[PDB]
Write a protein that binds this ligand. Structure first.
Ligand SMILES: [Mg+2]
Ligand SMILES: [Mg+2]
Ligand SMILES: [Mg+2]
Ligand SMILES: [Mg+2]
Ligand SMILES: [Mg+2]
Ligand SMILES: [Mg+2]
Ligand SMILES: [Mg+2]
Ligand SMILES: [Mg+2]
Lengths: 46, 205, 374, 120
RNA sequence: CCGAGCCUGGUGAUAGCUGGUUGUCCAAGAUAGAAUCUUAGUUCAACUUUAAAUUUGCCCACAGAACCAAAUCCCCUUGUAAAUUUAACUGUUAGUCCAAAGAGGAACAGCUCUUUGGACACUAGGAAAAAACCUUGUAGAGAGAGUAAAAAAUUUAACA
């Protein structure tokens, strides 16, 4: 029973870490797109 | 000339260099000489192989034996024996390559038309002679008129379009579904599960 | 075929003159000719006398057609060069080149040691400059040291008997000859021993290799029958005399009995030739110790097939393209299996069509060659 | 010549009839996928054998899971013929540290918020 | 026992030839080439495996890789864990079979001979029996349970 508990905690920790990774990846992709758009907008001056 | 020309055993110009007998020249359904060519009836090759001057001469003898030159003309569409198949010395040490050439034979794949017949004659009267020739033929064949080949093609198209299977040979094979790629042939994407080696399975819908 | 190479009307007419011995390019010739016409520096190992010289020359003629005549100014060196290891091979190459260049504009010349340097360094030989020049390494090195020739004007180099040109006696003179490095280099041979090929890698940069026939030990020609000598050496020459008696049958039928004898040593060749001439055999001997004029006369006679029996030293093992070669006796088996195969390919040099007979004597040092015979 | 062989992109091209036949939608994809072995590690590519090793599939007929990234997608599709995947859903929220213990996997896709001891 | 008497010493003679070579328990660990009076053996050759010293590998994505088909190589990320020099010994190299690719011979053969991929000389269940086909891999006990591969199908000649 403790073994099953430990395996369950393992699967939960893995799922949580993967979820945080996916969320941060989406946030980073949006931030990179926003930075690219801002640089493209600021590269058309002077 | 409403008669079948004689096929020589070898051409006047010979083949100086030795060459191999590749099964791939008879493997697969042939595209050239597949339909009727100035003919209303012929024999479609239902299989692959090589026909020599012996099979061609037997066919010519069986044709000229029973034909009416004023009503039925026959022209052999296949070429003369040209591919050199050799044989080594009898009682020679095993292995060690190839000797001189033995005999010539022209290879024909599946679907080739052999002898085009035409004139004032239908395929129904010559059906018996064509069936005797086909049973005596080197490879498997089928005596088909101009409309019989079209009827067979329409039947095959109907069988293909009326399929009810939840899984098809291409549907698992071209997908490489369940590891049949551990046994699937590299050329298997071409026959679509219809040509297996030297036998030709047109009956598979 | 040959028309796939885009031959010139002079080249096409010369190829038609080569019929019925040339009706289409050979498969090895097909592999060699247009890649050389693509200008790629390469080396080709194939059958001796298989038209490989013609395959190299046709692309060389096409490349020389794209070259200006302004580089052909006086005092300079040629742009098209060929190398041979023997004066006889160089003479045969020059004779073959002079037939094709009769209908062309390329000037063909030959250079070798032991000959008249006044004619070699003549005003219409060295100073007027030629398009095609086949040269021995010694005469070329002497000319370059004496400033009778140059090396910056070359544009297309051919190395015939390149494996023989890779000899330890022959490598140093070739390296001394090695010079604009951007010229198109083509090497021709029968086979490539590995320890010399990396030597080519000393002066190579992304080259190409064209190999013919079996990639294994292509020891046995399918058109050549071979035998193993199951007898001691003591009567073997007598057995060779018996073979000469068998060659007597070959002398009877008119089926040509041109016999080429392989002898390892020039003095041994001289002793065997004195024995054979004593034995009432029409034998002529060529060796590296023979006089240059005597060797030239003997080579002309063999080209005319005047002497049905001819002995050859280590100078004359490979590269031979002799018409009517029907009898080949390794009186001495070659010390190299490559040398034995090259002597074998020297006979029947018309191609896979002209047949011939091969008999090789077996001695004790050649006992280990019996495994090579396997 | 057996090899890791090319397969068409149409194998990963879904259909609206397929998305109805499956339980999937074109929008809002799965957040994490699950995998299992139901085929032998034997009798496939050794490259694919180490691929299943990379998948953490040294057990078999046992559950495992990963984040279904496009790289993970290609890795799974490399060994797809031997393996099975599942839409490793979670209708409730993700497991907080307060609820760190009581979790499980119901094979239709459920991740349990609290697998208590009494029925409904 | 005469094809060269017998015996003792020399003689533990010599051939690379066969065979047999003794109790236990943990860690790792199976097929590439070249020489050789040589294929019944050995040596250069690779792999290992270990001991020490030094930080990225395997799976890949773009570009790229030639003139006379499958493809393959160099190859950012992804997931996952080991990789480079210095050393010691042994040990394989005479592998079998199967799917693909060629060469020979009858396009006979448990025939030959080179490239790719497996397993195989090593467990268990099933195909009737099972070196090779399918599943399955790796440690013990329980008198639970789920599951995998899993027993062949089949018949006809009517006609205006
Ligand atoms: Mg080396
Ligand atoms: Mg080898
Ligand atoms: Mg004793
Ligand atoms: Mg002893
Ligand atoms: Mg022994
Ligand atoms: Mg030796
Ligand atoms: Mg020796
Ligand atoms: Mg030995």
């Amino acid at each position: 029973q403790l073994r099953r508990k430990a395996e369950r905690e393992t699967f939960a920790r893995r799922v949580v870490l993967l979820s945080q990774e996916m969320d941060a990846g989406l946030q980073a992709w949006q931030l990179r797109q926003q930075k690219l758009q801002e640089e493209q907008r600021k590269q058309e001056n002077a | 000339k409403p008669k079948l020309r004689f096929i020589e055993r070898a051409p006047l110009v010979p083949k100086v260099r030795r060459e191999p007998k590749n099964l791939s020249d008879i493997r697969g359904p042939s595209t050239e000489a597949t339909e009727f060519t100035e003919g209303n009836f012929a024999i479609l090759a239902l299989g692959g192989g090589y026909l020599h001057w012996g099979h061609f001469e037997m066919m010519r003898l069986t044709i000229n034996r029973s034909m009416d030159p004023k009503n039925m003309f026959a022209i052999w569409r296949v070429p003369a024996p040209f591919k050199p198949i050799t044989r080594k010395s009898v009682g020679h040490r095993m292995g060690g390559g190839k000797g001189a050439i033995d005999h010539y034979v022209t290879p024909v794949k599946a679907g080739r038309l052999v002898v085009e017949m035409g004139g004032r004659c239908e395929f129904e009267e010559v059906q018996g002679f064509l069936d005797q020739v086909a049973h005596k033929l080197p490879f498997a064949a089928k005596a088909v008129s101009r409309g019989t080949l079209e009827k067979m093609r329409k039947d095959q198209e109907e069988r293909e379009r009326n399929n009810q299977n939840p899984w098809t040979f291409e549907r698992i094979a071209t997908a490489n579904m369940l590891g049949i790629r551990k046994v699937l042939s590299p050329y298997d994407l071409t026959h679509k599960g219809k040509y297996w080696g030297k036998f030709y399975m047109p009956k598979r819908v | 075929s040959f028309a796939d190479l885009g031959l010139e009307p002079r080249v096409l007419h010369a190829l038609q003159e080569a019929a019925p011995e040339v009706v289409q390019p050979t498969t090895v010739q097909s592999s060699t000719i247009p890649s050389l016409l693509r200008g790629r520096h390469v080396v080709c190992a194939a059958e001796t006398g298989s038209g490989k010289t013609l395959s190299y020359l046709l692309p060389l003629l096409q490349r020389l057609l794209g070259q200006p005549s302004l580089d052909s100014l006086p005092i300079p060196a040629p742009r098209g060069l060929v190398l041979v290891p023997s004066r006889e091979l160089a003479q045969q190459v020059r004779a073959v080149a002079q037939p094709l260049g009769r209908s062309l504009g390329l000037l063909v010349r030959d250079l070798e040691g032991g000959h008249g340097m006044r004619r070699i360094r003549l005003q219409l030989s060295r100073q007027p400059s030629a398009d095609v020049l086949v040269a021995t390494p010694g005469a070329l090195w002497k000319a370059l040291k004496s400033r009778l020739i140059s090396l910056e004007q070359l544009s297309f180099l051919v190395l015939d008997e390149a494996d023989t040109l890779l000899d330890e006696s022959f490598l140093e003179l070739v390296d001394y000859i090695l010079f604009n490095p951007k010229a198109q280099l083509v090497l021709v041979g029968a086979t490539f021993p590995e320890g010399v090929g990396q030597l080519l890698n000393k002066v190579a940069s992304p080259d190409a290799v064209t190999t013919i026939t079996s990639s294994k030990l292509h020891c046995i020609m399918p058109h050549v029958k071979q035998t193993f000598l199951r007898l001691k050496g003591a009567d073997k020459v007598a057995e060779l005399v018996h073979i000469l008696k068998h060659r007597d049958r070959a002398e009877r039928t008119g089926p040509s009995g041109t016999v080429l004898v392989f002898c390892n040593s020039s003095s041994t060749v001289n002793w065997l030739g004195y024995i054979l001439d004593d034995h009432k055999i029409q034998h002529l001997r060529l060796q590296g110790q023979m006089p240059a004029l005597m060797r030239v006369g003997i080579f002309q006679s063999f080209q005319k097939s005047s002497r049905d029996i001819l002995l050859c030293t280590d100078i004359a093992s490979r590269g031979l393209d002799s018409t009517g070669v029907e009898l080949v006796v390794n009186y001495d088996f070659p010390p190299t299996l490559q040398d034995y195969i090259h002597r074998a390919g020297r006979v029947g040099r018309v191609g896979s069509e002209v047949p011939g007979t091969v008999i090789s004597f077996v001695t004790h040092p050649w006992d280990v060659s019996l495994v090579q015979k396997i | 010549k057996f090899t890791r062989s090319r397969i068409p992109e149409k194998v990963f091209q879904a259909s609206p009839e397929d998305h109805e036949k499956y339980g999937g939608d074109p929008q809002n994809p799965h957040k994490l996928h699950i995998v299992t072995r139901i085929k032998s590690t034997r009798r496939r590519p050794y490259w694919e054998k180490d691929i299943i090793k990379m998948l953490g599939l040294e057990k078999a007929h046992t559950p495992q899971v990963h984040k279904n990234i496009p790289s993970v997608n290609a890795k799974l599709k490399v060994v797809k013929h031997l393996i099975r995947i599942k839409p490793l859903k979670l209708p409730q929220g993700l497991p907080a540290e307060e609820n760190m213990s009581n979790t499980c996997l119901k094979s239709t896709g459920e991740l349990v918020v609290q697998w208590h001891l009494k029925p409904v």
